[PDB]
């Protein structure tokens, strides 16, 4: 029945700017403030601004006057979030939520906020389209079980997600762990790639990861050397 | 601002309290409680420091003392395993960092940690990486710590959340990024891999 609605997820570059839509419904919209509230992956959540539903009149952060605009239709109901002059440290879900209580006390929007959009995923990168690089990961036994060593493939700097990795054109699957990837500040995705092989294969069979970044249109056959 | 523990951990049945702690917290009493499930939005449970929304369990109840909140949880079950954010107020709204909740369905397993150097092309192309992938270890919370010689590093590290392995573990990877000048002008660069009090530290030199 109470239902906040936002738009879909976003890609911008730096100093562009964000547009994010917040649709209400079941209850009245002209009762209830609407909060701004962003979560940056590993991160607190961060309150940046609330709009006064009725009276448009909106309350900002201290780190976004000047750069974000909060205003609402009060014929479709919908409150919507501009934000300007993106850096790469606004990558972040961001959520609207309905402010507890409403235009009648001082503290009439920090009450409670319930409830919450599905949230609206932004992500500010300045690299379009981009191929990995891939580095091999030389073989060591040091951390894996007896008579094995582990080998890889860094997957470094590419965009968007996804990337598959296969190991010896598929050949080789037992053993093989792809980690997710990071996200880092650059805006650009790293992942990793082992394989738990023996030991003793090392020196006779060749082994090669299979890299396919579908996005930028590149694939990589690196193979593994051991470092003698 | 707001202080709050990164992750708790505790079994089904039992009890067990996240503190929050803040000098917004003894001013006023609007501190809140927000429990947010994987990819789902956050979710009042308490507000106005201790008044339980209708819908709510009873097993949540909050509670202040000074300047430090609290949220108990008893007869733990297990759909409490989320994040618990707290909420207050100074001159705007404010929260802590989150508490990852685990309840604790298999035996708390320490990481299993691999630490790769940078590879001789990388360094040679004027740039170095060093990859350190942790897996099975339960709960998913760990802490990451990068150590050239001895002295901690804290520029250059990127670290993913835990993800859900196949056998219900999690495995991360954190990536120290470095200048070749760096790589080669200490005598080794530690990853150290905090988990449930214990610690897993792996070391990889130049020279090697």
């Known amino acids: 029945q109470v239902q906040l609605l936002e738009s879909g997820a976003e890609v911008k570059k730096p100093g562009a700017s964000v547009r994010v839509s917040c649709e209400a419904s079941g209850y009245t919209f002209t009762k209830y403030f609407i909060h701004w509230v962003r979560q940056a992956p590993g991160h607190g959540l961060e309150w940046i601004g609330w709009i006064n539903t009725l009276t448009s009149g909106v309350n900002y952060a201290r780190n976004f006057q000047g750069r974000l605009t909060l205003t609402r239709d009060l014929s479709t109901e919908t409150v919507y979030m501009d934000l300007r002059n993106l850096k790469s440290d606004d990558t972040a879900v961001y959520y609207c939520?309905?402010?507890?209580?409403?235009?009648?006390?001082?503290?009439?929007?920090?009450?409670?906020?319930?409830?919450w959009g599905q949230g609206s995923l932004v992500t500010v990168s300045s690299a379009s389209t981009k191929g990995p690089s891939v580095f091999p990961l030389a073989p060591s036994s040091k951390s894996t079980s007896g008579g094995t060593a582990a080998l890889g493939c860094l997957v470094k700097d590419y965009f968007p997600e996804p990337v598959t990795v296969s190991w010896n054109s598929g050949a080789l699957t037992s053993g093989v762990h792809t980690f997710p990837a990071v996200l880092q500040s650059s805006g650009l995705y790293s992942l990793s790639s082992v394989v738990t092989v023996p030991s003793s294969s090392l020196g006779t069979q060749t082994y090669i990861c299979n890299v396919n970044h579908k996005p930028s249109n590149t694939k990589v056959d690196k193979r593994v050397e051991p470092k003698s | 601002e707001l202080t709050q523990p990164a992750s708790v951990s505790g079994s089904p049945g039992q009890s067990i309290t996240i503190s929050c702690t803040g000098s917004?917290?003894?001013?006023?009493?609007?501190v809140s409680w927000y429990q947010q499930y994987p990819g789902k939005a956050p979710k009042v449970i308490i507000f106005?420091?201790?008044k339980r929304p209708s819908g709510v369990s009873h097993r949540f109840s909050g509670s202040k003392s000074g300047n430090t909140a609290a949220l108990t949880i008893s007869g733990l079950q297990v759909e409490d395993e989320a994040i618990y954010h707290c909420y207050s107020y100074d001159d705007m709204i404010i929260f802590g960092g989150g508490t990852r909740l685990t309840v604790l369905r298999q035996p708390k397993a320490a990481p299993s940690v691999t630490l790769f150097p940078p590879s001789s092309e990388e360094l040679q192309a004027n740039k170095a990486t060093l990859v350190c992938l942790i897996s099975d270890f339960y709960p998913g919370a760990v802490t990451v710590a990068w150590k050239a010689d001895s002295s901690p590093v804290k520029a250059g590290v990127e670290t993913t959340t835990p993800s859900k392995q196949s056998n219900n573990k999690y495995a991360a990877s954190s990536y120290l990024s470095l200048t070749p000048e760096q790589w080669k002008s200490h005598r080794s660069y530690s990853c150290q891999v905090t988990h449930e009090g214990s610690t897993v530290e792996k070391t990889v030199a130049p020279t090697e």
């Open positions: 917004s917290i003894g001013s006023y009493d609007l």
């Open positions: 106005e420091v201790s």
């Open positions: 939520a309905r402010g507890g209580r409403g235009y009648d006390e001082p503290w009439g929007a920090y009450t409670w906020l319930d409830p």
